[PDB]
């Protein structure tokens, strides 16, 4: 996350870190059930001789705050047993960029490990709404991934403006969240993590999934996220959540 700040300990208990063998943190995910994580499909495409599409090559860390303290009380380490990328994921356009990850062994709820609620198909997060991206991704373009989990307050942008800022690249599955003055944005290695909508009432829904951007934190180029509501029935159907 660019232009964000340190999360407070245990403030985002659904945020997960996905480590690939030999690489440390690579992608984000979201705890939705004791057995299931929601992440971005494009994180599990074989690349550079490494088989990212292969569950066995991944470790998931839950209740993690600080990448240099993975043995902290609260952290739960879980192997994956399955990866289910959306069948319409297109790695050329990034359309339908969502995936479900099955844990080998169930997460255990705690002060540091708690699930986030899924939105109904009908759920709407209107233009101008202040929401949240979290992650351990780079803190600048071409920079270094945060050790402490980062949070960024960003605002929904309307789909007409979105399509205009990113012509020929925005599909109905996508939403722009951010600012036109850039500055605060998702970046590399935030992908697959939660876009979190925190309501004034205390309820917390997952608006979307970190997908892509044209660079990070650039003027007129806000991050693009997969819209979660569209996938409710696809999630119920394949996971049972």
């Amino acid at each position: 996350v660019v232009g964000g700040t340190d999360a407070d300990e245990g403030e985002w208990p659904w945020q997960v870190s996905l480590h690939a063998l030999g690489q440390g943190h690579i992608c984000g995910a979201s705890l939705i059930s004791p057995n299931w994580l929601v992440s971005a499909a494009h994180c599990y495409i074989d690349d550079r001789g490494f088989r990212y599409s292969d569950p066995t090559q991944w470790t998931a860390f839950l209740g993690l705050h600080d990448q240099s303290q993975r043995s902290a009380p609260g952290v739960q380490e879980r192997r994956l047993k399955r990866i289910i990328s959306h069948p319409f994921f297109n790695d050329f356009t990034f359309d339908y960029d969502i995936a479900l990850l099955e844990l080998e062994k169930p997460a255990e709820y705690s002060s540091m490990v708690r699930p986030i609620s899924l939105p109904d198909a009908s759920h709407v997060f209107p233009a101008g709404k202040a929401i949240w991206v979290t992650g351990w991704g780079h803190t600048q373009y071409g920079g270094t991934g945060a050790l402490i989990l980062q949070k960024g307050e960003i605002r929904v942008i309307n789909q007409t403006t979105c399509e205009n800022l990113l012509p020929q690249q925005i599909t109905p599955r996508m939403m722009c969240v951010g600012f036109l003055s850039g500055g605060v944005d998702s970046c590399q290695g935030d992908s697959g993590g939660p876009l979190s909508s925190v309501e004034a009432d205390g309820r917390i829904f997952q608006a979307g999934v970190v997908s892509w951007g044209d660079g990070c934190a650039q003027r007129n180029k806000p991050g693009v996220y997969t819209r979660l509501p569209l996938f409710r029935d696809w999630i119920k159907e394949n996971t049972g959540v």
């Epitope: 495409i45 690349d47 297109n90 012509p167 992908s191 990070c216």
Partner: antibody, heavy 128, light 108 residues
Framework: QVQLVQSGGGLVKPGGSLRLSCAAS????????MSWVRQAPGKGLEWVSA????????YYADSVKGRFTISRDNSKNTLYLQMSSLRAEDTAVYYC?????????????????????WGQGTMVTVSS | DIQMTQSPSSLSASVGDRVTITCRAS??????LAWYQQKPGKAPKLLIY???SLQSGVPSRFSGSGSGTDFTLTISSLQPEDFAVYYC?????????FGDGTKVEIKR
């Protein structure tokens, strides 16, 4: 340095078939969608086909849809194009080409790019 | 299917001259317009992307401007090695479509 070394080509009778090759080196091949672009003798440039980095998604220009097949082997760092049902109008030089990425240090879709590196070209002559 | 149209079809200019070529798209393309340089027997070479951005290692006398449907490549000061066919390409939609080409010959 980034290189795209092509091979293949030649003379093929109409209706016949051919496989063009592009061997890539100097960058992470698998991270890059690729295209084949052609140029008829004395004529302009025509985009022919494209493939995402994974091999998952493929596109073709109309004049060539159904007759051609673009594919890739990321373990050999090579791009392929199978041409079939070859007509006279397919006679041309075929280049392979890599997309120009504006911000390569974050991953994203590659559908809006012109082409920064090109192979040397492969002449294909269709004739009886 | 976007049609790209180039003017003039060919031209002749003197070393040191300013040269200006025009490209026209049949529908708007935002800024997704590129300019290539093709020398005989060689592959096209990327000069300009996104209408006005100069590829690195490309000489400073090459420059582009424009938006939507209407684009210009300028060579501020023509050099002999600038002999070539110059192509515009739209880089927005599939099929990516090239202009028909502007042949620049040197006048000597």
């Amino acid at each position: 340095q980034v290189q795209l070394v092509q091979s293949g080509g030649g003379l093929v009778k109409p209706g016949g078939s051919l496989r063009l090759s592009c061997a890539a080196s100097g960058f992470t091949f698998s991270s890059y969608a690729m295209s084949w672009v052609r140029q008829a003798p004395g004529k302009g440039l025509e985009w022919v086909s494209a493939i995402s980095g994974s091999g998952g998604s493929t596109y073709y220009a109309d004049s060539v849809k159904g007759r051609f097949t673009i594919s890739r082997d990321n373990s050999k760092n090579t791009l392929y194009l199978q041409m079939s049902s070859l007509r006279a109008e397919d006679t041309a030089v075929y280049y392979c080409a890599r997309p120009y990425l504006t911000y390569p240090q974050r991953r994203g879709p590659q559908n809006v790019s012109p082409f920064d590196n090109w192979g040397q070209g492969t002449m294909v002559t269709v004739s009886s | 299917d976007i049609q790209m149209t180039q003017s003039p079809s060919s031209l002749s200019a003197s070393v040191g001259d300013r040269v200006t070529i025009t490209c026209r798209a049949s529908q708007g393309i935002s800024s997704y317009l590129a300019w290539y340089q093709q020398k005989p027997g060689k592959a096209p070479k990327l000069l300009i992307y996104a209408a006005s951005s100069l590829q690195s290692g490309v000489p400073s006398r090459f420059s582009g401007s424009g938006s939507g449907t209407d684009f210009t490549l300028t060579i501020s000061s023509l050099q002999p090695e600038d002999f070539a066919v110059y192509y515009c390409q739209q880089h927005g939609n599939l099929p990516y479509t090239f202009g028909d080409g502007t042949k620049v010959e040197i006048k000597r």
